[PDB]
Design a protein around this nucleic acid. Structure first.
Lengths: 129, 129, 129, 129, 129, 129
RNA sequence: CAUGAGGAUUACCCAUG
RNA sequence: CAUGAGGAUUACCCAUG
RNA sequence: UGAGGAUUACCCA
RNA sequence: UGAGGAUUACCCA
């Protein structure tokens, strides 16, 4: 059994899909990277820790790159014009059961479901109105 | 037009669904709360700001309560045994187009899709392995 | 293959069986827990290290909880009345072959087999005499 | 109800079985050894004590000889190259009943049952993967 | 796309082939060993990390046992007289694409191809002349 | 004989093959380079030393360049965008016979053979999982 | 000299012993 | 690192070498 | 802790 | 900035 596996980060039907694969798991921090130039790759990291006596805390990070070609002195390198950074921390008391956790996950999926306020604002370069 | 509307945070088919409704939008911070006792309610907040010259930054927060009844001196009040806290920050350069933003959103939805590493770890009170 | 799989820790003839599953591998420590709130779960951890130039040491830990419901601040929480702890360290010389290691495993199984001295004493809350 | 008797430590089904018998009882520490020289013997020791006000603690030690290429009755140096050491400590809260203790024994048996992760890894000179 | 599987390390054409299989995955470092005692085994380990801002680095280690006059399963001292150690470090700039990386692998294969200088010198206990 | 000969480092079926030739042996370091300007050449170096009283250590280095044309001071020069570095050290005990050494060579060849774990990961810009 | 899943401008440098 | 029939709130702490 | 900033497992109050 | 903690739009380095 293992969940430190490869998975689809961005789904575009079946083609153009962005897949991220395991790359490193040093110091309790799991890392996934997409293939090809590390410089233009998507990155995902995850870790859990006992934040306090009663809490466990997940720290998740995602990096979405803007693929571009850099030319300098006639030398061109595959780079990322810029990157979008996602940073999330999830705190869960040790009294939470698997049921409570599944609920927390549905809340996160619901928060980002298509058509809902927040994902809509973000996708349109907007805020709330 | 308005996206500061009511929406389903937790989806349980059609029954038991947790709906969050607008409640306040003071100081550029939008807030949604579920119905009934504010003490046992789900909470969602969102805001955007120009974090720097080139970046805009979204700050989103979600609160999942563990509904319980508190009895003290024979007096019982509707409370939350504890709460799970979600805290996410999304940074997006001003060069991002609506297309770039839609991609960023799919990355977030993919990260949390059922069966993928992270949501699976969380739902099972686990880490990566 | 991959030996990091779930298994039955406490066998009660398929009914009320305490089964434990892979939950974390951060920092080279393999962890297994039962489907419970992290506060009431059975926990098993394992790690191997090359303790010396010519030795390998396995460190195994098992946590057996006495589940209970506690009323804190006039509120009920799933918790553990107390926990029992098993800490075992096994040092094997690098010269031991697979058959030598199989011999060690059999010794540990025979040691704890029903009816034998030690498990008998433990279960009866007594010493050896 | 004297339980300080000999038993089969390594079971090979009648043939090639290793029996271990009472050999010492100095200081309440019970000892069993196989019929070998003490340098090549199978040794088992066990004792119980009130570790603290809240706990009792069983200390179980096992010594297993490396058998491959072993010269029966010979002088094999260095000692650390020919022996494996098992060190078990079981902490049990004073509130544990015989029933509670029986379950703790089952947990130990389950941990080491044939085909499960830990014993499988040990028998294959492996770790968890 | 899990690539952590067993493979043939030493190929003698079906007969006398040395297979190496997954034996550990602690700390992201993958390990494979042959079916021997760890003192006489063939060991292979591999890990990747972002050595710096500009580079990624693969660390590959191999341990090969001295076989001539070897006593299978025996205790052979000193350890340094019976084992060879291979230590490989591969530094790859983040701009390298999969194509670039495929070429780097071909270079490594060419370096060690049968009949070429380096492998010929090593196999003959020689240097370059 | 004399093993200091040229050889094919990168094989592309006799067309676009990177062949490397003897270029220097100063200071006991055998060097090979490809037909290029010293700034864009593939480089291979090898040296053997009696690292200890009872050991011999081979130190091998390979440099794979990413050729490019750079405009410096408004002038075009053949150069390397970046370089990939392979550094390997092999320690062999003086007791290893020629057949023992042949075994080491085969292990290194099997390690990098197409389809096996490591070369697969490297070529796909990923780790082992 | 030794050890480092230490670094690089790559036959050099760093830390520890 | 090692040793403890050393302790625990249990991947931590203590003593000795 | 922070609708604190990032060259993003770093850094400031 | 922080795999920094929360009574969670607060607070610490």
């Amino acid at each position: 059994a293992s969940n430190f596996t490869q998975f689809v980060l961005v789904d575009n039907g079946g083609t153009g899909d962005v897949t991220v694969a395991p790359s490193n798991f040093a110091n309790g921090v799991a890392e996934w990277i997409s293939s090809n130039s590390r410089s233009q790759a998507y990155k995902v990291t995850c870790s859990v820790r006992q934040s306090s006596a009663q809490n466990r805390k997940y720290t998740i990070k995602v990096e979405v790159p803007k693929v571009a070609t850099q030319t300098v002195g006639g030398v061109e390198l595959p780079v990322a014009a810029w990157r979008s950074y996602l940073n999330m921390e999830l705190t869960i008391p040790i009294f939470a059961t698997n049921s409570d956790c599944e609920l927390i996950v549905k809340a996160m999926q619901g928060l980002l479901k298509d058509g809902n306020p927040i994902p809509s604002a973000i996708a349109a370069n907007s805020g709330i109105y």
